[PDB]
Design a protein around this nucleic acid. Sequence first.
RNA 1: CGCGGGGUGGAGCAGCCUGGUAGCUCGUCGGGCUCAUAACCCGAAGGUCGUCGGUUCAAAUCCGGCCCCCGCAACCA
RNA 2: AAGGGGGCCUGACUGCGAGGCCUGCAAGCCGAGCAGGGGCGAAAGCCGGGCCUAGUGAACCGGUGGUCCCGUGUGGAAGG
RNA 3: CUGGUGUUGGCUCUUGGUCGCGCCUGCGUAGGAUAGGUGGGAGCCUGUGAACCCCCGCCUCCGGGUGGGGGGGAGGCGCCGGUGAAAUACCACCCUGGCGCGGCUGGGGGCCUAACCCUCGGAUGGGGGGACAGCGCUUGGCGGGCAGUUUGACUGGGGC
RNA 4: UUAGGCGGGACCUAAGGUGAAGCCGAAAGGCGUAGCCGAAGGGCAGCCGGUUAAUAUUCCGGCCCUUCCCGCAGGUGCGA
RNA 5: GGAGGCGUAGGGAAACCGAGUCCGAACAGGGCGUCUAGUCCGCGGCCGUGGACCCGAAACCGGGCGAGCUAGCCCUGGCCAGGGUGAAGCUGGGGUGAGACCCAGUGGAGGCCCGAACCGGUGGGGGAUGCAAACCCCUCGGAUGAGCUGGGGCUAGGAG
RNA 6: CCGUGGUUCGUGGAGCCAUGGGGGAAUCUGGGCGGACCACCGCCUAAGGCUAAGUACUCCGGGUGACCGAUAGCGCACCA
RNA 7: CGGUAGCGGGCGUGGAUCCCUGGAUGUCCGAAUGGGGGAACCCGGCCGGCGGGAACGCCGGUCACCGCGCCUUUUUGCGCGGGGGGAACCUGGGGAACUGAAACAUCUCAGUACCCAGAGGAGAGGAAAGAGAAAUCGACUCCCUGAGUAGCGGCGAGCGAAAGGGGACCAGCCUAAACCGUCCGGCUUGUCCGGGCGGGGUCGUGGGGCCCUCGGACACCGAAUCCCCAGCCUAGCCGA
Lengths: 146, 97
Amino acid sequence: MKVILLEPLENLGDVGQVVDVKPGYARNYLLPRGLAVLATESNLKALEARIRAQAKRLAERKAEAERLKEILENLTLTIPVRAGETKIYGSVTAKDIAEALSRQHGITIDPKRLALEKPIKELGEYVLTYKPHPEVPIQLKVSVVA
Amino acid sequence: SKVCEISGKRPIVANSIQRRGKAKREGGVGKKTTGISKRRQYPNLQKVRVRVAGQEITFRVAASHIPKVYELVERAKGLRLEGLSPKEIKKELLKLL
RNA sequence: CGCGGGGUGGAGCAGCCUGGUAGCUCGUCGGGCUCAUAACCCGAAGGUCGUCGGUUCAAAUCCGGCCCCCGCAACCA
RNA sequence: AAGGGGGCCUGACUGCGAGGCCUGCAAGCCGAGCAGGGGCGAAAGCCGGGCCUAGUGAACCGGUGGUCCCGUGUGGAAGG
RNA sequence: CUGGUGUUGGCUCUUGGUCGCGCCUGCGUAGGAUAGGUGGGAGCCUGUGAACCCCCGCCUCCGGGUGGGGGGGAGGCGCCGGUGAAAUACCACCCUGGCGCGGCUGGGGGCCUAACCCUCGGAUGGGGGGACAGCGCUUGGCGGGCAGUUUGACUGGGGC
RNA sequence: UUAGGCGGGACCUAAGGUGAAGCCGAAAGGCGUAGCCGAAGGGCAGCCGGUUAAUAUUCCGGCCCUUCCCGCAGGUGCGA
RNA sequence: GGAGGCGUAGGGAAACCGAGUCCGAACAGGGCGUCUAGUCCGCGGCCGUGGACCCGAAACCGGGCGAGCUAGCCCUGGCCAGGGUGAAGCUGGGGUGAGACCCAGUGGAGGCCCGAACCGGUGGGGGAUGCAAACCCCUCGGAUGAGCUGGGGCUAGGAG
RNA sequence: CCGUGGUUCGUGGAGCCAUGGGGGAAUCUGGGCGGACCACCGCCUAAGGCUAAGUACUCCGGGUGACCGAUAGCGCACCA
RNA sequence: CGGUAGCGGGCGUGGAUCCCUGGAUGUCCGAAUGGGGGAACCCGGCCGGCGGGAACGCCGGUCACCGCGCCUUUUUGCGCGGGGGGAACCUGGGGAACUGAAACAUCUCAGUACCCAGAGGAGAGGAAAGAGAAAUCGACUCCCUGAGUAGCGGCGAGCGAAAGGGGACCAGCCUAAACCGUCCGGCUUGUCCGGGCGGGGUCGUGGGGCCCUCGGACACCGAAUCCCCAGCCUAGCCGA
Ligand SMILES: [Mg+2]
Ligand SMILES: [Mg+2]
Ligand SMILES: [Mg+2]
Ligand SMILES: [Mg+2]
Ligand SMILES: [Mg+2]
Ligand SMILES: [Mg+2]
Ligand SMILES: [Mg+2]
Ligand SMILES: [Mg+2]
Ligand SMILES: [Mg+2]
Ligand SMILES: [Mg+2]
Ligand SMILES: [Mg+2]
Ligand SMILES: [Mg+2]
Ligand SMILES: [Mg+2]
Ligand SMILES: [Mg+2]
Ligand SMILES: [Mg+2]
Ligand SMILES: [Mg+2]
Ligand SMILES: [Mg+2]
Ligand SMILES: [Mg+2]
Ligand SMILES: [Mg+2]
Ligand SMILES: [Mg+2]
Ligand SMILES: [Mg+2]
Ligand SMILES: [Mg+2]
Ligand SMILES: [Mg+2]
Ligand SMILES: [Mg+2]
Ligand SMILES: [Mg+2]
Ligand SMILES: [Mg+2]
Ligand SMILES: [Mg+2]
Ligand SMILES: [Mg+2]
Ligand SMILES: [Mg+2]
Ligand SMILES: [Mg+2]
Ligand SMILES: [Mg+2]
Ligand SMILES: [Mg+2]
Ligand SMILES: [Mg+2]
Ligand SMILES: [Mg+2]
Ligand SMILES: [Mg+2]
Ligand SMILES: [Mg+2]
Ligand SMILES: [Mg+2]
Ligand SMILES: [Mg+2]
Ligand SMILES: [Mg+2]
Ligand SMILES: [Mg+2]
Ligand SMILES: [Mg+2]
Ligand SMILES: [Mg+2]
Ligand SMILES: [Mg+2]
Ligand SMILES: [Mg+2]
Ligand SMILES: [Mg+2]
Ligand SMILES: [Mg+2]
Ligand SMILES: [Mg+2]
Ligand SMILES: [Mg+2]
Ligand SMILES: [Mg+2]
Ligand SMILES: [Mg+2]
Ligand SMILES: [Mg+2]
Ligand SMILES: [Mg+2]
Ligand SMILES: [Mg+2]
Ligand SMILES: [Mg+2]
Ligand SMILES: [Mg+2]
Ligand SMILES: [Mg+2]
Ligand SMILES: [Mg+2]
Ligand SMILES: [Mg+2]
Ligand SMILES: [Mg+2]
Ligand SMILES: [Mg+2]
Ligand SMILES: [Mg+2]
Ligand SMILES: [Mg+2]
Ligand SMILES: [Mg+2]
Ligand SMILES: [Mg+2]
Ligand SMILES: [Mg+2]
Ligand SMILES: [Mg+2]
Ligand SMILES: [Mg+2]
Ligand SMILES: [Mg+2]
Ligand SMILES: [Mg+2]
Ligand SMILES: [Mg+2]
Ligand SMILES: [Mg+2]
Ligand SMILES: [Mg+2]
Ligand SMILES: [Mg+2]
Ligand SMILES: [Mg+2]
Ligand SMILES: [Mg+2]
Ligand SMILES: [Mg+2]
Ligand SMILES: [Mg+2]
Ligand SMILES: [Mg+2]
Ligand SMILES: [Mg+2]
Ligand SMILES: [Mg+2]
Ligand SMILES: [Mg+2]
Ligand SMILES: [Mg+2]
Ligand SMILES: [Mg+2]
Ligand SMILES: [Mg+2]
Ligand SMILES: [Mg+2]
Ligand SMILES: [Mg+2]
Ligand SMILES: [Mg+2]
Ligand SMILES: [Mg+2]
Ligand SMILES: [Mg+2]
Ligand SMILES: [Mg+2]
Ligand SMILES: [Mg+2]
Ligand SMILES: [Mg+2]
Ligand SMILES: [Mg+2]
Ligand SMILES: [Mg+2]
Ligand SMILES: [Mg+2]
Ligand SMILES: [Mg+2]
Ligand SMILES: [Mg+2]
Ligand SMILES: [Mg+2]
Ligand SMILES: [Mg+2]
Ligand SMILES: [Mg+2]
Ligand SMILES: [Mg+2]
Ligand SMILES: [Mg+2]
Ligand SMILES: [Mg+2]
Ligand SMILES: [Mg+2]
Ligand SMILES: [Mg+2]
Ligand SMILES: [Mg+2]
Ligand SMILES: [Mg+2]
Ligand SMILES: [Mg+2]
Ligand SMILES: [Mg+2]
Ligand SMILES: [Mg+2]
Ligand SMILES: [Mg+2]
Ligand SMILES: [Mg+2]
Ligand SMILES: [Mg+2]
Ligand SMILES: [Mg+2]
Ligand SMILES: [Mg+2]
Ligand SMILES: [Mg+2]
Ligand SMILES: [Mg+2]
Ligand SMILES: [Mg+2]
Ligand SMILES: [Mg+2]
Ligand SMILES: [Mg+2]
Ligand SMILES: [Mg+2]
Ligand SMILES: [Mg+2]
Ligand SMILES: [Mg+2]
Ligand SMILES: [Mg+2]
Ligand SMILES: [Mg+2]
Ligand SMILES: [Mg+2]
Ligand SMILES: [Mg+2]
Ligand SMILES: [Mg+2]
Ligand SMILES: [Mg+2]
Ligand SMILES: [Mg+2]
Ligand SMILES: [Mg+2]
Ligand SMILES: [Mg+2]
Ligand SMILES: [Mg+2]
Ligand SMILES: [Mg+2]
Ligand SMILES: [Mg+2]
Ligand SMILES: [Mg+2]
Ligand SMILES: [Mg+2]
Ligand SMILES: [Mg+2]
Ligand SMILES: [Mg+2]
Ligand SMILES: [Mg+2]
Ligand SMILES: [Mg+2]
Ligand SMILES: [Mg+2]
Ligand SMILES: [Mg+2]
Ligand SMILES: [Mg+2]
Ligand SMILES: [Mg+2]
Ligand SMILES: [Mg+2]
Ligand SMILES: [Mg+2]
Ligand SMILES: [Mg+2]
Ligand SMILES: [Mg+2]
Ligand SMILES: [Mg+2]
Ligand SMILES: [Mg+2]
Ligand SMILES: [Mg+2]
Ligand SMILES: [Mg+2]
Ligand SMILES: [Mg+2]
Ligand SMILES: [Mg+2]
Ligand SMILES: [Mg+2]
Ligand SMILES: [Mg+2]
Ligand SMILES: [Mg+2]
Ligand SMILES: [Mg+2]
Ligand SMILES: [Mg+2]
Ligand SMILES: [Mg+2]
Ligand SMILES: [Mg+2]
Ligand SMILES: [Mg+2]
Ligand SMILES: [Mg+2]
Ligand SMILES: [Mg+2]
Ligand SMILES: [Mg+2]
Ligand SMILES: [Mg+2]
Ligand SMILES: [Mg+2]
Ligand SMILES: [Mg+2]
Ligand SMILES: [Mg+2]
Ligand SMILES: [Mg+2]
Ligand SMILES: [Mg+2]
Ligand SMILES: [Mg+2]
Ligand SMILES: [Mg+2]
Ligand SMILES: [Mg+2]
Ligand SMILES: [Mg+2]
Ligand SMILES: [Mg+2]
Ligand SMILES: [Mg+2]
Ligand SMILES: [Mg+2]
Ligand SMILES: [Mg+2]
Ligand SMILES: [Mg+2]
Ligand SMILES: [Mg+2]
Ligand SMILES: [Mg+2]
Ligand SMILES: [Mg+2]
Ligand SMILES: [Mg+2]
Ligand SMILES: [Mg+2]
Ligand SMILES: [Mg+2]
Ligand SMILES: [Mg+2]
Ligand SMILES: [Mg+2]
Ligand SMILES: [Mg+2]
Ligand SMILES: [Mg+2]
Ligand SMILES: [Mg+2]
Ligand SMILES: [Mg+2]
Ligand SMILES: [Mg+2]
Ligand SMILES: [Mg+2]
Ligand SMILES: [Mg+2]
Ligand SMILES: [Mg+2]
Ligand SMILES: [Mg+2]
Ligand SMILES: [Mg+2]
Ligand SMILES: [Mg+2]
Ligand SMILES: [Mg+2]
Ligand SMILES: [Mg+2]
Ligand SMILES: [Mg+2]
Ligand SMILES: [Mg+2]
Ligand SMILES: [Mg+2]
Ligand SMILES: [Mg+2]
Ligand SMILES: [Mg+2]
Ligand SMILES: [Mg+2]
Ligand SMILES: [Mg+2]
Ligand SMILES: [Mg+2]
Ligand SMILES: [Mg+2]
Ligand SMILES: [Mg+2]
Ligand SMILES: [Mg+2]
Ligand SMILES: [Mg+2]
Ligand SMILES: [Mg+2]
Ligand SMILES: [Mg+2]
Ligand SMILES: [Mg+2]
Ligand SMILES: [Mg+2]
Ligand SMILES: [Mg+2]
Ligand SMILES: [Mg+2]
Ligand SMILES: [Mg+2]
Ligand SMILES: [Mg+2]
Ligand SMILES: [Mg+2]
Ligand SMILES: [Mg+2]
Ligand SMILES: [Mg+2]
Ligand SMILES: [Mg+2]
Ligand SMILES: [Mg+2]
Ligand SMILES: [Mg+2]
Ligand SMILES: [Mg+2]
Ligand SMILES: [Mg+2]
Ligand SMILES: [Mg+2]
Ligand SMILES: [Mg+2]
Ligand SMILES: [Mg+2]
Ligand SMILES: [Mg+2]
Ligand SMILES: [Mg+2]
Ligand SMILES: [Mg+2]
Ligand SMILES: [Mg+2]
Ligand SMILES: [Mg+2]
Ligand SMILES: [Mg+2]
Ligand SMILES: [Mg+2]
Ligand SMILES: [Mg+2]
Ligand SMILES: [Mg+2]
Ligand SMILES: [Mg+2]
Ligand SMILES: [Mg+2]
Ligand SMILES: [Mg+2]
Ligand SMILES: [Mg+2]
Ligand SMILES: [Mg+2]
Ligand SMILES: [Mg+2]
Ligand SMILES: [Mg+2]
Ligand SMILES: [Mg+2]
Ligand SMILES: [Mg+2]
Ligand SMILES: [Mg+2]
Ligand SMILES: [Mg+2]
Ligand SMILES: [Mg+2]
Ligand SMILES: [Mg+2]
Ligand SMILES: [Mg+2]
Ligand SMILES: [Mg+2]
Ligand SMILES: [Mg+2]
Ligand SMILES: [Mg+2]
Ligand SMILES: [Mg+2]
C-alpha cells in the first residue's frame, strides 16, 4: 500500500514521499523500524503542515532578506580610520564592518555571513558580498577613509 | 480456529456435495449427487503481533481484517495507555472498534 | 458425440517442422567367403507414398472433404 | 404365383380413418374409404414397403433438425 | 499426497510466453549468385564521402548473405534483360524464423530477515529454520482405517 | 459409646484430582503452571493394672510423657 | 360477517378461439365437448393422510449412567511353613615360562525341585425346582515369580 | 469469483437473502432490487440500534363438562 | 392450645384461636461466594465482644469470582451489575436414525428428537437497499383465504410457497457522518492529527451540513418516561 518515508531510503524514495510498497514490506519491516509510517488520510494531512509551514518560513526568510538587498545595494558605508597615504592597518574586519553598520545606519548584520578574507589593509573603495540567505546575493559598498 | 477478534468471524457448517456426470448446461443428462455431508469452514485466522504504547500486543484475526488491526494502532496513538498491562491495552483497542 | 496423429516396398520405417531425394533395417533373389552355420561383403527385383478434389515451376512434405487403424477424454435415459 | 426375367419408377407417401380381430390394463393386428401430391398401366385398376406369422423395449432423463406456441414490468436473450 | 491462492517480505542471476517497434532471415536445376511472397518499378543511390582495400561484428547449405569501424575524393546500380515459371536496382505490406530494445505477464537457481516456526533458566533480545513449513479457502488423487447399503426370481427343499 | 498420648483432622507429600496464569475448542467443554486437595506411605507425646449389667491405651490407681501461652534465669547474631 | 369456495363452457401444450374447439391445405374425416343442475348441512358405506383394528420383534439413532464385577496400567503397603539340589564367586592345593584348566573346602545362584498357606481349576463322582444363577468331595497345576494380595487412582460403548 | 446455507427451487435458464475463501469500489451524476444477461421503464436506500398491542404456553388460581368413578381417572383420591 | 384421643397444664368480650397485609426471627447445605470438601461437615485471616483469658473456645461483623464504570495515583480504593432455578411456551448455536421410498445411495423422516447458550411473562419480528406489475401497496406479528394453487421432485416417494383479498392489532423512534464547541494526549509545532464529552443530524417527495433571504421561535403536537386518581387482586359483610 501507500506509505511515507520517515528517512531517506535509496532506490525507494527520499524522506517525505508517498510511495507504494507491498503491504508485508511495510508491516514487518519499514513501519516497525521507524523507517516509514502509514499514508493514512490523517498522516497525509499532518505531513502537509510541515510542507506548508517549512516552505512558508523559507519563502519568508528569502523575502526577509530582500528588505536588506534593496537598501544595501543602494547605499555606501563610509569607515574613517587614522591613516597614511594608502596604509595604516586596523581591526577593520567584518566585526568592525557590522559595528560600524549598526551605529551608522542602525541595521545589524552577521559578521560571519559577510564575505571577507582578511581585515582591510589599505584605504580604498571596497565591494563586499553579504550572503544572509543562500539564494540572495548582496553587493556591499564600503569605503575606508581618513 | 476460533473467533476473529476484530470481525467476530467464526467457523460455520457447510456441506460437501459430491456430484457426477455431465451438466445439462453442456448438453449432458445432468449432474447426479453421490453424497452430501457436513464439514466446517474456518476463518483464515492469523496472528498479528504489534506494539502499542511500547508494550507488545498480539491479535488473532482473520486475514481479511489484518489491516484493521493496524488501523487501531494508528487510532490509539491519541491515547493515555502507559503502565497498562498488555491485556488492559488490548481490551481498550478493541473498544475503539 | 468432442479432440490428438498415422497410413510410405512383403513386415516394422526416419523422411514430414524446413516444397527439389519413394531412403533405412529386417525379408526374398543372385554372386563372394565358408567344416559348415551364422555373421561379414558386392549387386538386385520390389510403392498410386489411403483416397478424391485443390495452392504450386514441382510437392509422401501444404491445404478441403472422405476412407480406415490406433490413440485421448467425456457421456450413456 | 407369393416363384424366374425385364421396362419404367420411390406409395419404404402426407393429412385422416367407417368398421372389426385380439385383449385385465397397456400394448399388438387387419382395414375399406376421403383429401393432397405422385408411380406404373391403353384400361379396369394396383401402390400408405417386403407371401404371411420372429427380427424387439413403456415412461423418465438428455441430444439433433424444424416450428415460432409460452418466456416472470416492456423488447430481446436464457429456458421451455 | 497434491496444484492454485491468503498469511507472504527484501536483493539478484537466469529463462519462456504473448504484443509492439527496429533489423536480418530465404541457397534444387537456370543462373552474373543465396531470387521468400506479392504490389508500386523506370528510374534511381549519389563530393549527403562512391569503387578496387584494412581492422573486425555475427550467420553460412563453406559459394559468402549481412554489417559497426580505418584510408578514401568519384564512381558503383538496375532499367536494358540473358539463363527463368518468377528479375535482379529503390520502395511498401506480408510470410518462415532469429535477434535487439519496450510493455503485460509465467517458469527456474542463489543470497537475505523481518511475518511464521523452533530454542535460549536471561526475552522490545540472542541463536536455528525461514517466506519454505504450519494454518485458511479451493483443485484433483490414493483411500475397508471407517460408514451406509446392494448382492434377483423360477426351482418336486435350498445350493450347484 | 467419656481420650492432649489410640485412629483421623487443625502436619507432609504419591499416583491421581483440582486449578488464578496461560493455551485450545461452534456451545457444553479440553489441556494446564503456581497454588490447593489427595494415604493403609512419611511425621508425632502412654504403659501396667483396677472398675461397669453394658465403655475403657478414653473412667480410676500407680509410674511416664507432648505441644502451646506468660513470666523468669542463663545462653546466642536472632531471623524463612 | 360474501373475503372466499363449488356451480352456470368447453377445446387446446399454448397463443387462442368458443357451442364449439383440436389435428389439418381442407368447405374430408376423426377426438374431446354442446343438447342445462347444482350446491349446503346431517347420517351411512368405503377410500387418502395421520400409530389408523389390537398386542409382538431382532435392530438403528440421540443424550446420559457405569471399571465397588471383570481387563490393563499408575501410586503405596502386605504375604510366600518346612525340606531338597548346590551355579558363580572366594580360599587353598595341583599344573605351566606365565596360562588355560583340575581337585577340595567354603559359598548360597535359579521365570530350579518336593510341598502348606496363598493363587489356580486337570480327571472322576455327587449336585441339576441345588447348600450354590457354577457349588461339594476325592484327585490334580503353580507355589522367589512373567508370583499372590490390600488400600488409593486412570482408561468405556464402534469405545476401552 | 470460489465453497455453501435459506426459499416452493434437489445445479436448474438460478435471480433474491445469507457468507467460510480470494479480488476489491463509489458518497446521489452514488449505489441495491423487479428470477441468467443486456437495454428500457420503474421500486428501494445496504454495510448502526430500540419499540407496545394483536400471538404462544399453563407450575399456579377460578369456572364449566351427553369427562372417569378406585383394574377407571394423573404413576399417586390413602403418609407416592 | 394443628392432624390427636390420652396424661399434664393454660388462654378468650381487657375481643383469644382463625383469615388477610406489612414486619421480625430464620441453625447447616445448596448459585453457595474466606478456604477445603465425600452437599448438610472440616479449617482459617482481619476487626470487635464474651469467659480468669495470653494460650483455648464461643459470639457479631467481614473476606469468592467475572463484567462494566476504569469514576480507579496501574498499586489501592469505590460503584452498579452478573452467577442459580422455573411446568410448558420462545429465540439462537449444533443436530440424528428408525421409517417412507413396498430393496436403496439422491430424496424422505426433519431442521424433527435430542444436546448447548440465552430471553421473559412472553420471546421472536418490526419501521423497506420491501413487495412485484398495479402507472399498485406502504413496519412487524397473528387468524381465515389465496392453495394442496404456483412451483419443487431418482419429475419417484413425496414436498409445498408468495402476492392479493377478508380480519386481530395498530406506532413509531434513536443514532453514525458533515459541521460548530470543549477537554486530555501527540511531537512531522499545528487553518494539524488522535481520543472523550456537548451541540448539530436522521434521509427516498432523497435527506442533512455549511453561507444568503421570509417565516415562526409564546402557535402546535407530545410520550413507550415520571406523578396522581378510578378501577382491579390479595381478608370479608348483608342477604326474602
Ligand atoms: Mg530501495
Ligand atoms: Mg504513489
Ligand atoms: Mg501557522
Ligand atoms: Mg479463538
Ligand atoms: Mg453456520
Ligand atoms: Mg448451517
Ligand atoms: Mg438432478
Ligand atoms: Mg503476522
Ligand atoms: Mg516495559
Ligand atoms: Mg507480546
Ligand atoms: Mg490484505
Ligand atoms: Mg483482500
Ligand atoms: Mg482509556
Ligand atoms: Mg517401429
Ligand atoms: Mg412375379
Ligand atoms: Mg423364368
Ligand atoms: Mg428360374
Ligand atoms: Mg423376380
Ligand atoms: Mg435380378
Ligand atoms: Mg421390376
Ligand atoms: Mg414407361
Ligand atoms: Mg420408411
Ligand atoms: Mg357407424
Ligand atoms: Mg362415426
Ligand atoms: Mg384393448
Ligand atoms: Mg409384435
Ligand atoms: Mg392415380
Ligand atoms: Mg398394359
Ligand atoms: Mg395414364
Ligand atoms: Mg406396399
Ligand atoms: Mg423378404
Ligand atoms: Mg421380413
Ligand atoms: Mg424385448
Ligand atoms: Mg424414475
Ligand atoms: Mg428433447
Ligand atoms: Mg423433454
Ligand atoms: Mg414471442
Ligand atoms: Mg418475452
Ligand atoms: Mg422480459
Ligand atoms: Mg422474447
Ligand atoms: Mg426450442
Ligand atoms: Mg492443499
Ligand atoms: Mg496449498
Ligand atoms: Mg508474496
Ligand atoms: Mg504462498
Ligand atoms: Mg527469485
Ligand atoms: Mg538478467
Ligand atoms: Mg521475463
Ligand atoms: Mg506503444
Ligand atoms: Mg523479397
Ligand atoms: Mg590495400
Ligand atoms: Mg590480411
Ligand atoms: Mg561465426
Ligand atoms: Mg569471402
Ligand atoms: Mg564478413
Ligand atoms: Mg567507413
Ligand atoms: Mg582514425
Ligand atoms: Mg542488355
Ligand atoms: Mg532475349
Ligand atoms: Mg536479386
Ligand atoms: Mg519509391
Ligand atoms: Mg512471419
Ligand atoms: Mg511484470
Ligand atoms: Mg519461480
Ligand atoms: Mg528446480
Ligand atoms: Mg538461508
Ligand atoms: Mg530468525
Ligand atoms: Mg538466518
Ligand atoms: Mg522480533
Ligand atoms: Mg533465568
Ligand atoms: Mg529454561
Ligand atoms: Mg525469539
Ligand atoms: Mg530483552
Ligand atoms: Mg531470532
Ligand atoms: Mg506457505
Ligand atoms: Mg494405491
Ligand atoms: Mg471402497
Ligand atoms: Mg439390487
Ligand atoms: Mg451383508
Ligand atoms: Mg414341480
Ligand atoms: Mg439354482
Ligand atoms: Mg498405635
Ligand atoms: Mg477412625
Ligand atoms: Mg502433583
Ligand atoms: Mg482439569
Ligand atoms: Mg498440580
Ligand atoms: Mg480462569
Ligand atoms: Mg483462561
Ligand atoms: Mg464439538
Ligand atoms: Mg477455560
Ligand atoms: Mg496436573
Ligand atoms: Mg511442574
Ligand atoms: Mg508444589
Ligand atoms: Mg502445602
Ligand atoms: Mg499447606
Ligand atoms: Mg481430591
Ligand atoms: Mg495437605
Ligand atoms: Mg491432606
Ligand atoms: Mg496418614
Ligand atoms: Mg500413618
Ligand atoms: Mg506430624
Ligand atoms: Mg503409641
Ligand atoms: Mg473388661
Ligand atoms: Mg490395659
Ligand atoms: Mg376454502
Ligand atoms: Mg402473449
Ligand atoms: Mg383459435
Ligand atoms: Mg354445437
Ligand atoms: Mg387451420
Ligand atoms: Mg374436406
Ligand atoms: Mg371439421
Ligand atoms: Mg369412431
Ligand atoms: Mg367435431
Ligand atoms: Mg359428439
Ligand atoms: Mg341445448
Ligand atoms: Mg344429442
Ligand atoms: Mg347436461
Ligand atoms: Mg362420507
Ligand atoms: Mg398417499
Ligand atoms: Mg405402530
Ligand atoms: Mg382407518
Ligand atoms: Mg384411513
Ligand atoms: Mg443406520
Ligand atoms: Mg450397528
Ligand atoms: Mg461417567
Ligand atoms: Mg475395578
Ligand atoms: Mg497394609
Ligand atoms: Mg522374603
Ligand atoms: Mg522353599
Ligand atoms: Mg537328601
Ligand atoms: Mg539348604
Ligand atoms: Mg562344582
Ligand atoms: Mg576374598
Ligand atoms: Mg584370585
Ligand atoms: Mg583354603
Ligand atoms: Mg590337590
Ligand atoms: Mg596355585
Ligand atoms: Mg609350557
Ligand atoms: Mg561370597
Ligand atoms: Mg565351588
Ligand atoms: Mg536354594
Ligand atoms: Mg514345578
Ligand atoms: Mg475355588
Ligand atoms: Mg484322575
Ligand atoms: Mg460332576
Ligand atoms: Mg456328573
Ligand atoms: Mg438346573
Ligand atoms: Mg494320584
Ligand atoms: Mg500336590
Ligand atoms: Mg497344590
Ligand atoms: Mg509334578
Ligand atoms: Mg502391588
Ligand atoms: Mg485398584
Ligand atoms: Mg456400542
Ligand atoms: Mg472413530
Ligand atoms: Mg469414541
Ligand atoms: Mg475395541
Ligand atoms: Mg454464492
Ligand atoms: Mg445461512
Ligand atoms: Mg438450498
Ligand atoms: Mg420454511
Ligand atoms: Mg440454492
Ligand atoms: Mg428445473
Ligand atoms: Mg436459487
Ligand atoms: Mg442480479
Ligand atoms: Mg451468503
Ligand atoms: Mg466473502
Ligand atoms: Mg460507484
Ligand atoms: Mg470524494
Ligand atoms: Mg437514484
Ligand atoms: Mg423488488
Ligand atoms: Mg426481469
Ligand atoms: Mg447484472
Ligand atoms: Mg423495491
Ligand atoms: Mg437502518
Ligand atoms: Mg420486542
Ligand atoms: Mg388451573
Ligand atoms: Mg381448574
Ligand atoms: Mg359414570
Ligand atoms: Mg382400588
Ligand atoms: Mg368399588
Ligand atoms: Mg379394592
Ligand atoms: Mg387393582
Ligand atoms: Mg397431578
Ligand atoms: Mg391425605
Ligand atoms: Mg403420600
Ligand atoms: Mg407425587
Ligand atoms: Mg405426597
Ligand atoms: Mg396427618
Ligand atoms: Mg390433643
Ligand atoms: Mg399433637
Ligand atoms: Mg397421656
Ligand atoms: Mg387431665
Ligand atoms: Mg377489633
Ligand atoms: Mg429453610
Ligand atoms: Mg466451596
Ligand atoms: Mg462475599
Ligand atoms: Mg475438610
Ligand atoms: Mg493462622
Ligand atoms: Mg470468621
Ligand atoms: Mg486520577
Ligand atoms: Mg490502570
Ligand atoms: Mg486497573
Ligand atoms: Mg450507588
Ligand atoms: Mg438475569
Ligand atoms: Mg440461567
Ligand atoms: Mg446467531
Ligand atoms: Mg434448535
Ligand atoms: Mg452459542
Ligand atoms: Mg435414512
Ligand atoms: Mg408410506
Ligand atoms: Mg423402505
Ligand atoms: Mg418396505
Ligand atoms: Mg416417517
Ligand atoms: Mg439449525
Ligand atoms: Mg421447514
Ligand atoms: Mg418443536
Ligand atoms: Mg401484563
Ligand atoms: Mg408481545
Ligand atoms: Mg400479553
Ligand atoms: Mg415482545
Ligand atoms: Mg427487536
Ligand atoms: Mg432489529
Ligand atoms: Mg417508506
Ligand atoms: Mg415478478
Ligand atoms: Mg390496482
Ligand atoms: Mg396495469
Ligand atoms: Mg387501478
Ligand atoms: Mg405510478
Ligand atoms: Mg420431498
Ligand atoms: Mg420442496
Ligand atoms: Mg422437507
Ligand atoms: Mg426440499
Ligand atoms: Mg413454507
Ligand atoms: Mg418469490
Ligand atoms: Mg397473505
Ligand atoms: Mg367483509
Ligand atoms: Mg391484511
Ligand atoms: Mg381478539
Ligand atoms: Mg401502521
Ligand atoms: Mg448526540
Ligand atoms: Mg463513529
Ligand atoms: Mg503550537
Ligand atoms: Mg502553531
Ligand atoms: Mg458528561
Ligand atoms: Mg458525538
Ligand atoms: Mg458529538
Ligand atoms: Mg436530536
Ligand atoms: Mg422513489
Ligand atoms: Mg442535495
Ligand atoms: Mg443542502
Ligand atoms: Mg434580505
Ligand atoms: Mg425573504
Ligand atoms: Mg406567518
Ligand atoms: Mg394558544
Ligand atoms: Mg399518560
Ligand atoms: Mg384480601
Ligand atoms: Mg368478593
Ligand atoms: Mg347470613
Ligand atoms: Mg336465609
